Scaffold this active site. Structure first.
Site, PDB file in Angstrom:
ATOM      1  N   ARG A  83      40.758  25.734  63.303  1.00 36.98           N
ATOM      2  CA  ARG A  83      40.708  25.365  64.714  1.00 36.98           C
ATOM      3  C   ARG A  83      39.331  25.162  65.328  1.00 36.98           C
ATOM      4  O   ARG A  83      39.244  24.821  66.503  1.00 36.98           O
ATOM      5  CB  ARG A  83      41.443  26.403  65.556  1.00 36.98           C
ATOM      6  CG  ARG A  83      42.950  26.328  65.437  1.00 36.98           C
ATOM      7  CD  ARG A  83      43.601  27.453  66.221  1.00 36.98           C
ATOM      8  NE  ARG A  83      43.594  28.749  65.516  1.00 36.98           N
ATOM      9  CZ  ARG A  83      43.740  29.912  66.145  1.00 36.98           C
ATOM     10  NH1 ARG A  83      43.872  29.899  67.465  1.00 36.98           N
ATOM     11  NH2 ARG A  83      43.757  31.079  65.474  1.00 36.98           N
ATOM     12  N   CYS A 141      46.294  28.944  62.231  1.00 32.02           N
ATOM     13  CA  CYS A 141      45.410  27.915  61.713  1.00 32.02           C
ATOM     14  C   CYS A 141      43.951  28.330  61.682  1.00 32.02           C
ATOM     15  O   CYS A 141      43.326  28.597  62.718  1.00 32.02           O
ATOM     16  CB  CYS A 141      45.539  26.621  62.539  1.00 32.02           C
ATOM     17  SG  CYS A 141      44.437  25.332  61.955  1.00 32.02           S
ATOM     18  N   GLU A 147      44.940  26.593  49.353  1.00 33.64           N
ATOM     19  CA  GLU A 147      46.272  26.083  49.638  1.00 33.64           C
ATOM     20  C   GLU A 147      46.835  25.495  48.375  1.00 33.64           C
ATOM     21  O   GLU A 147      47.990  25.727  48.031  1.00 33.64           O
ATOM     22  CB  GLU A 147      46.251  25.028  50.732  1.00 33.64           C
ATOM     23  CG  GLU A 147      45.916  25.571  52.096  1.00 33.64           C
ATOM     24  CD  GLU A 147      46.064  24.514  53.191  1.00 33.64           C
ATOM     25  OE1 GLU A 147      47.211  24.239  53.575  1.00 33.64           O
ATOM     26  OE2 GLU A 147      45.032  23.997  53.683  1.00 33.64           O
ATOM     27  N   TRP A 159      42.515  18.409  56.662  1.00 37.80           N
ATOM     28  CA  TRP A 159      42.098  18.394  55.272  1.00 37.80           C
ATOM     29  C   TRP A 159      42.333  19.769  54.674  1.00 37.80           C
ATOM     30  O   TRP A 159      42.488  20.755  55.397  1.00 37.80           O
ATOM     31  CB  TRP A 159      40.636  17.974  55.140  1.00 37.80           C
ATOM     32  CG  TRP A 159      39.708  18.788  55.971  1.00 37.80           C
ATOM     33  CD1 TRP A 159      39.277  20.064  55.715  1.00 37.80           C
ATOM     34  CD2 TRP A 159      39.079  18.391  57.196  1.00 37.80           C
ATOM     35  NE1 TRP A 159      38.426  20.482  56.709  1.00 37.80           N
ATOM     36  CE2 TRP A 159      38.292  19.477  57.634  1.00 37.80           C
ATOM     37  CE3 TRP A 159      39.117  17.233  57.973  1.00 37.80           C
ATOM     38  CZ2 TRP A 159      37.541  19.431  58.808  1.00 37.80           C
ATOM     39  CZ3 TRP A 159      38.366  17.186  59.142  1.00 37.80           C
ATOM     40  CH2 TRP A 159      37.584  18.273  59.541  1.00 37.80           C
TER      41      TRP A 159
HETATM   42  C1  HEM Z   1      41.209  19.781  60.111  1.00 36.80           C
HETATM   43  C2  HEM Z   1      41.247  20.650  59.088  1.00 36.80           C
HETATM   44  C3  HEM Z   1      42.265  21.812  58.993  1.00 36.80           C
HETATM   45  C4  HEM Z   1      42.183  22.843  58.146  1.00 36.80           C
HETATM   46  C5  HEM Z   1      41.058  23.088  57.118  1.00 36.80           C
HETATM   47  C6  HEM Z   1      43.330  23.700  58.371  1.00 36.80           C
HETATM   48  C7  HEM Z   1      43.634  24.876  57.727  1.00 36.80           C
HETATM   49  C8  HEM Z   1      44.887  25.425  57.809  1.00 36.80           C
HETATM   50  C9  HEM Z   1      45.528  26.238  56.802  1.00 36.80           C
HETATM   51  C10 HEM Z   1      44.903  26.658  55.457  1.00 36.80           C
HETATM   52  C11 HEM Z   1      46.732  26.575  57.255  1.00 36.80           C
HETATM   53  C12 HEM Z   1      47.753  27.427  56.483  1.00 36.80           C
HETATM   54  C13 HEM Z   1      48.761  26.431  55.903  1.00 36.80           C
HETATM   55  C14 HEM Z   1      49.850  27.145  55.141  1.00 36.80           C
HETATM   56  O1  HEM Z   1      49.605  28.299  54.691  1.00 36.80           O
HETATM   57  O2  HEM Z   1      50.954  26.550  54.985  1.00 36.80           O
HETATM   58  C15 HEM Z   1      46.923  25.975  58.566  1.00 36.80           C
HETATM   59  C16 HEM Z   1      48.049  26.091  59.369  1.00 36.80           C
HETATM   60  C17 HEM Z   1      48.336  25.420  60.546  1.00 36.80           C
HETATM   61  N1  HEM Z   1      47.543  24.441  61.154  1.00 36.80           N
HETATM   62 FE1  HEM Z   1      45.675  23.933  60.454  1.00 36.80          FE
HETATM   63  N2  HEM Z   1      44.100  23.160  59.377  1.00 36.80           N
HETATM   64  C18 HEM Z   1      43.471  21.990  59.776  1.00 36.80           C
HETATM   65  C19 HEM Z   1      43.920  21.130  60.741  1.00 36.80           C
HETATM   66  C20 HEM Z   1      44.966  21.273  61.613  1.00 36.80           C
HETATM   67  C21 HEM Z   1      45.412  20.269  62.564  1.00 36.80           C
HETATM   68  C22 HEM Z   1      44.758  18.872  62.697  1.00 36.80           C
HETATM   69  C23 HEM Z   1      46.458  20.787  63.237  1.00 36.80           C
HETATM   70  C24 HEM Z   1      47.315  20.185  64.383  1.00 36.80           C
HETATM   71  C25 HEM Z   1      46.943  19.132  65.128  1.00 36.80           C
HETATM   72  C26 HEM Z   1      46.669  22.124  62.723  1.00 36.80           C
HETATM   73  C27 HEM Z   1      47.614  23.014  63.136  1.00 36.80           C
HETATM   74  C28 HEM Z   1      48.138  23.981  62.318  1.00 36.80           C
HETATM   75  C29 HEM Z   1      49.397  24.649  62.530  1.00 36.80           C
HETATM   76  C30 HEM Z   1      50.430  24.467  63.678  1.00 36.80           C
HETATM   77  C31 HEM Z   1      49.524  25.609  61.356  1.00 36.80           C
HETATM   78  C32 HEM Z   1      50.723  26.547  61.136  1.00 36.80           C
HETATM   79  C33 HEM Z   1      51.559  25.919  60.036  1.00 36.80           C
HETATM   80  C34 HEM Z   1      52.829  26.697  59.925  1.00 36.80           C
HETATM   81  O3  HEM Z   1      53.084  27.510  60.857  1.00 36.80           O
HETATM   82  O4  HEM Z   1      53.553  26.493  58.909  1.00 36.80           O
HETATM   83  N3  HEM Z   1      45.760  22.381  61.736  1.00 36.80           N
HETATM   84  N4  HEM Z   1      45.763  25.285  58.869  1.00 36.80           N
HETATM   85  C1  LIG Z   2      55.326  27.012  55.624  1.00 33.63           C
HETATM   86  N1  LIG Z   2      54.924  27.208  54.217  1.00 33.63           N
HETATM   87  C2  LIG Z   2      55.481  26.168  53.333  1.00 33.63           C
HETATM   88  C3  LIG Z   2      54.524  25.057  53.166  1.00 33.63           C
HETATM   89  C4  LIG Z   2      53.801  24.112  53.057  1.00 33.63           C
HETATM   90  C5  LIG Z   2      52.980  23.118  53.018  1.00 33.63           C
HETATM   91  C6  LIG Z   2      53.211  22.132  52.045  1.00 33.63           C
HETATM   92  C7  LIG Z   2      52.381  21.022  51.968  1.00 33.63           C
HETATM   93  F1  LIG Z   2      52.593  20.072  51.041  1.00 33.63           F
HETATM   94  C8  LIG Z   2      51.318  20.892  52.850  1.00 33.63           C
HETATM   95  C9  LIG Z   2      51.091  21.871  53.811  1.00 33.63           C
HETATM   96  C10 LIG Z   2      49.925  21.684  54.748  1.00 33.63           C
HETATM   97  C11 LIG Z   2      49.566  22.887  55.617  1.00 33.63           C
HETATM   98  C12 LIG Z   2      48.300  22.397  56.270  1.00 33.63           C
HETATM   99  C13 LIG Z   2      48.368  21.723  57.475  1.00 33.63           C
HETATM  100  C14 LIG Z   2      47.219  21.232  58.059  1.00 33.63           C
HETATM  101  C15 LIG Z   2      47.302  20.494  59.374  1.00 33.63           C
HETATM  102  C16 LIG Z   2      46.008  21.427  57.424  1.00 33.63           C
HETATM  103  C17 LIG Z   2      45.978  22.109  56.219  1.00 33.63           C
HETATM  104  N2  LIG Z   2      44.801  22.294  55.589  1.00 33.63           N
HETATM  105  N3  LIG Z   2      47.114  22.563  55.659  1.00 33.63           N
HETATM  106  C18 LIG Z   2      51.926  22.986  53.895  1.00 33.63           C
END
Ligand code: HEM
Ligand SMILES: CNCC#Cc1cc(F)cc(CCc2cc(C)cc(N)n2)c1
Ligand code: HEM
Ligand SMILES: CNCC#Cc1cc(F)cc(CCc2cc(C)cc(N)n2)c1
Ligand SMILES: C[C@H](O)[C@H](O)[C@H]1CNc2nc(N)[nH]c(=O)c2N1
Ligand SMILES: C[C@H](O)[C@H](O)[C@H]1CNc2nc(N)[nH]c(=O)c2N1
Ligand SMILES: [Zn+2]
Lengths: 410, 413
Positions: A111, A108, A285, A280
């Site tokens: 963070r 993420c 993405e 957000w």
């Molecule tokens: C607040 C604004 C946030 C932004 C801009 C952000 C940004 C991102 C992005 C771009 C990803 C990659 C998503 C993907 O490629 O599928 C990600 C992954 C992730 N985020 Fe964040 N995130 C945010 C909030 C959060 C929050 C609130 C949580 C948990 C409470 C979180 C936990 C995670 C986790 C666990 C992943 C891994 C997802 C996976 O393994 O499929 N994030 N984040």
């Molecule tokens: C594991 N790869 C497959 C996928 C997917 C995916 C699809 C969606 F419609 C939304 C998000 C959101 C991922 C995300 C999570 C959080 C907490 C923030 C953020 N900016 N994006 C992921």
């Protein structure tokens, strides 16, 4: 040993000590590295020292390690893992566990925000109707009319596996995907199976290109139940371009709230199998992965068409060009609508600053370069040149199996 | 440690099965508890250490030519054994040298160009004794490899390491690079990456033109002696001026690059033998120049200036003005090379070729070590196939390895 990491653009070195606290495997060994593998393949005895460890670090974070409150809490929890084969987290322990699971999320890039997390305790939930009420409040609260706010809603922890709460949607808001007889695909191809499961459960598909899927909610191990999120709660953005006036003619919209609901929140050896969480969007993405992946909405060809670009050879970089403009439009649209969004430049900056913070204050920061580096313009963002160490700190978010592959239907 | 590891392509659903990882050797730097996958870099061998390394490579060679366990195979073992026993080292047959070099490339996890691994011209320069001779060899390499713009991959291998105090080294990290000059006011002229090396050369006697695109001299070390400066004959350095198929003003930026990418700071290991000087060269992937050399902040950093002449909103970073300029620059670089008929590959074609290569390797070899962090291009990652490709990273030998910069270790005569 202490371990150093270098930025190759700034030559800053940082020293990582925090990694000495990990336990969960990374999936690598000395001989093989699995850093690009997306998913590397409890009782009274197993649960307590996990419970002990988490309690220990909680009371260590609030400067009361060894305190009376601490000692009794260890007793309280032991007595309870005996006579229930599990235990219940205090409310303060729930909130702390949730924020730190986000702080430990290697993949993420957002963070820096980890401590600003609204935590919704839904451990009193018992039904899918209950779940739906809780999720709707989550959605409404976190959407907040475009001024998005981070939130997590935590449902009852796993007990025996048979009585599991699950949100079946991988995310709270997604677009349906329809398998055409004529081979192609309407909507979002990534979901097509799930969409079919909803139709099969009784959902009436509008069969449009952007049809918000219904929620499928499983409470205490029973059959999931369909629910339509009230549309006024589902905030959406029409994608237009600040120079290409023909861009709105493409018909593109995306939802404003990214909300992941298929993961497992683990705290003190307890497993929260349903914990939808949201923040957000980073623009890429949507603009890169959702819209341009070949297996997704796949519009690059269409966009390059309207841009009148020469598409006969790869080396004209027509795909690259189309990609940049698509993302300019996405960032523009959300901004125009006062909907919270971050570009990958700003987001990566923030994360480098956040890394500094963690190394200084916490002695390290597990990060996954593969996921942290944006899917476009990689090396012109600062995290490309940033070495990162990856390791598993707990509390964490884990992957869990898809519920439709483990459920015993009724 | 399991016998069969599986990797998935998430775009195509293709699953591949890796068995070759079982033949892994040295450490990755990773452990059960931590991964160093994005870490760039995570006194000789004894008789006892060399034997099992030699036999390893030798068995492997006679396996490749389908003569494993043959008379020739056992005779080669016995001959090498004898040689290590008496002379504390051993010499490679030319056939073995050539097999070893092609396999070090084949095994190179960070190389996206490996589909060409079996087309490699190996120049055996192990009879070399002097820097002048090294200069001769390297010149012939450059000329052969450049081939008037129709590049050909080649490696020149100088004598192996002996005691440690007699290493052959190219001090240049690459055969052809541009000087960097630190200015009194802290600004840099030329290539800011090469300031340190440029100062070394100037000290060694180089008279610097102090320009933006000054090809550096070679600094060459034979048999552990102090290195010596040689100027590469200019007619041998093929160069490409950068223009744009649309923007006529692009040529006014005064940009150019050299056609031949040639790494000269690595160590080639074959059968436990160390070749500390083994310059090798292929052809450029466009992004190496257009994205990294041209647009890295600590490099020629041309993004701002290009953006200026494109008239982009440069106040809001969410305008993606950087991203817009980047594409155009890599469009110009590719265009300039194609027009001068100098071999270059765009990141789309290269990554697709590599997916096909990797698949073939899994099929015929049971695996193909790859370093995702290096393989995925530094622009438009996700729209190239390797992005969605799970890879496994492990060290197979023969191999190219990093080695200390020689100015940090050399004992001056
Ligand atoms: C607040 C604004 C946030 C932004 C801009 C952000 C940004 C991102 C992005 C771009 C990803 C990659 C998503 C993907 O490629 O599928 C990600 C992954 C992730 N985020 Fe964040 N995130 C945010 C909030 C959060 C929050 C609130 C949580 C948990 C409470 C979180 C936990 C995670 C986790 C666990 C992943 C891994 C997802 C996976 O393994 O499929 N994030 N984040
Ligand atoms: C594991 N790869 C497959 C996928 C997917 C995916 C699809 C969606 F419609 C939304 C998000 C959101 C991922 C995300 C999570 C959080 C907490 C923030 C953020 N900016 N994006 C992921
Ligand atoms: C034939 C055309 C070739 C192409 C198109 C190609 C492409 C590339 C690219 C783009 C990189 C990343 C370079 C960087 O970012 O610094 C790379 C790395 C590498 N290549 Fe290839 N390559 C080719 C030939 C070769 C040959 C002939 C060899 C060796 C015999 C080789 C061995 C390597 C090694 C060892 C690396 C890692 C370099 C390092 O660690 O700094 N390549 N290649
Ligand atoms: C280790 N990272 C820093 C660096 C560097 C570098 C500098 C240069 F001037 C040329 C090349 C070329 C790398 C390369 C090698 C080969 C054999 C082919 C190819 N396309 N690129 C690399
Ligand atoms: C195989 C590889 O791990 C996979 O394509 C990864 C690469 N990096 C990623 N990075 C992000 N942010 N999201 C992803 O889904 C992926 N996918
Ligand atoms: C920290 C990180 O490993 C470093 O910036 C890497 C990323 N991937 C790369 N990939 C290639 N091809 N070349 C590089 O120099 C780098 N740099
Ligand atoms: Zn690893």
């Amino acid at each position: 040993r202490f371990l150093k990491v270098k930025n190759w653009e700034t030559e800053v070195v940082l020293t990582d000590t925090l990694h000495l606290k990990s336990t969960l495997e990374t999936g690598c060994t000395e001989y093989i590295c699995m850093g690009s593998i997306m998913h590397p393949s409890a009782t009274k005895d197993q649960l307590f020292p996990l419970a002990k460890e988490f309690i220990d670090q909680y009371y260590s974070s609030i400067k009361r390690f060894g305190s009376k409150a601490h000692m009794e809490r260890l007793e309280e929890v032991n007595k309870e893992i005996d006579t229930t084969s599990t235990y219940q987290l205090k409310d303060t322990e729930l909130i702390y566990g949730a924020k730190h699971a986000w702080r430990n999320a290697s993949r993420c890039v957002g963070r820096i925000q980890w401590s600003k997390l609204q935590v919704f305790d839904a451990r009193d939930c018992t039904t899918a109707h209950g779940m739906f009420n809780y999720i709707c409040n989550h959605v409404k609260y976190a959407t907040n009319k475009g001024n998005l706010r981070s939130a997590i809603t935590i449902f009852p922890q796993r007990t025996d596996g048979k009585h599991d709460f699950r949100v079946w949607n991988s995310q709270l808001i997604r677009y349906a995907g329809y398998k055409q007889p004529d081979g192609s695909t309407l909507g979002d191809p990534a979901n097509v199976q799930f969409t079919e499961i909803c139709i099969q459960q009784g959902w009436k598909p509008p069969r449009g290109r952007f049809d918000v899927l219904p929620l499928l909610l499983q409470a205490n191990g029973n059959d999931p139940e369909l629910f339509q999120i009230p549309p006024e709660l589902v905030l959406e953005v029409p994608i237009r371009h600040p120079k290409f006036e023909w861009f709105k003619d493409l018909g593109l919209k995306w939802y404003g709230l990214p909300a992941v609901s298929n993961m497992l929140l683990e705290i003190g050896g307890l497993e929260f199998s349903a914990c939808p969480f949201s923040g957000w969007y980073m623009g890429t993405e949507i603009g890169v992965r959702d819209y341009c992946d070949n297996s997704r909405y796949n519009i690059l060809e269409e966009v390059a068409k309207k841009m009148n670009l020469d598409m006969r050879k790869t080396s004209s970089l027509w795909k690259d060009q189309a990609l940049v403009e698509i993302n300019i439009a996405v960032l523009y649209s959300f901004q125009s609508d006062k909907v919270t969004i971050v570009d990958h430049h700003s987001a990566t900056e923030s994360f480098i600053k956040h890394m500094e913070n963690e190394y200084r204050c916490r002695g390290g920061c597990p990060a996954d370069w593969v996921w942290i580096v944006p899917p476009m313009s990689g090396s012109i963002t600062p995290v490309f040149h940033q070495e990162m160490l990856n390791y598993r700190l707990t509390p964490s978010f884990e992957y869990q199996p898809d519920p439709w592959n483990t459920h015993v239907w009724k």
